Amino acid sequence: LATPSPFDMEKMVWLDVNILEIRKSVLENFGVDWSKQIPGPFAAFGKDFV
Amino acid sequence: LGNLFKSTNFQSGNTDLVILVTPRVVSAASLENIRQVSQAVEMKDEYRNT
After folding, report:
1. How many CB atoms are located within 10 Å of the residue A29 CB?
2. Which residues contact A45 (CB under 8 A, 6 or more apart)?
3. CB contact under 8 A, A20 and B46
4. For B44, which residue in chain A has the nearest alpha carbon?
5. Is A22's Cβ below 8 Å from some Cβ in B?
6. Contact indicator for A22, B42 with CB cutoff of 8 Å
């Protein structure tokens, strides 16, 4: 004839979460940048034999 | 002198890569956990001091 409870009281849990992030960066760009491809010498010939 | 009559294109390179793993059976008191908790404390302190 016994009856159950509507529900069972459960233990409660507390959760503590930490998330830590650090970012660092360095950027340098220095010097003299020259041309690396330049025109070369040229030669040409032309004649009319007849 | 032949370099006045010849063009050369050259490329070279190398890549090295290693991937390694280490498992350990731990608890919350183990050295691996403690070191990372220490790292978190240090990160918080650095942020505070800035």
Report:
1. 5
2. none
3. no
4. A20
5. yes
6. no
